[PDB]
Amino acid sequence: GMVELPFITPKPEDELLIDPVAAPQLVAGDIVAEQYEVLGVIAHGGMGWIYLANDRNVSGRIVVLKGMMADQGTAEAEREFLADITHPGIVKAYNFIDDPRVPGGFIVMEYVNGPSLKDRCKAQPDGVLRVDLAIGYILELLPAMDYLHQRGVVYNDLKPENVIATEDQVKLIDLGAVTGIGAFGYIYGTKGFQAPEVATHGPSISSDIFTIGRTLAALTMPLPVEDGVLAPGIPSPKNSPLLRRHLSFYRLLQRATADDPQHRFRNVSELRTQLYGVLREILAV
Ligand SMILES: [Mg+2]
């Protein structure tokens, strides 16, 4: 139920860093946890700067240092679960470390070398991908979402910017947003992509299904933005020539983003069947 994605050449190592909101707390050459030699920063996020480093213990390995969200037994089990995720469509978690210069500590994860799907969209004149390519990217990441779901776990923050296209693959990079199905407390989704029921009922496979539909919509068509947030709903075929030509695609997007979670696709496999069917229709005509 997957297709062939174009090969995306990774960036050379001498082109991975940006030029440094506040100044970074670490700079090139700094040694973290006596294992990681800092190379620089690759982005500034809500948790502060996100660093790139050499892992000295593993030959050739480049890692990402990202701030962690600041009862040891429970925290130990959650860290071991992240570390043991085996699926190649998900970024690897290598370590969880502290540092006297960064109070919150770092999660140490695999550096995925490639553009995000948002980056690919921004390189187009219409700011969107061709519909067959966007569907192919979603089909490619569905095994990774399902791997989590079948282990009682959800990704919560799927959006074009945390799916990275590398080589002929895509990887999910947002390990920090993962929670158990039905987890209590505040869930770190993104408004405009997150399902409406999460803030009151907790996350579920159905709320992940919702973010997949919003992500696919964002990859393929312009979406109205209100106050920095993608407005709710799917554009109408009356307003979108893409949807008027592919009415089954419009229907799929509405079902995946149904206000009532019970009306959405029940799991990733049900979504894949219809999604691959929409693609074959588009490629047939
Ligand atoms: Mg996130």
Residue numbers in the entry: 133 to 152, 160 to 209, 215 to 429
Reproduce the article's own wording on this structure.
Finally, we tested the kinase activity of a CgPknG deletion mutant lacking residues 1 to 129 and 434 to 822. These results indicate that neither residues 1 to 129 within the N-terminal region nor the TPR domain of CgPknG has an effect on the intrinsic kinase activity, supporting previous evidence for MtbPknG that both regions contribute to stabilize the enzyme-FHA substrate complex.
Both in Corynebacterium glutamicum, a soil bacterium used for the industrial production of amino acids, and in the pathogen Mycobacterium tuberculosis, PknG modulates the 2-oxoglutarate dehydrogenase activity in the Krebs cycle by controlling the phosphorylation status of the regulator OdhI (called GarA in the genus Mycobacterium). To investigate the conservation of mechanisms involved in the regulation of PknG, we studied the kinase isoform from C. glutamicum (CgPknG), which is devoid of an Rdx domain.
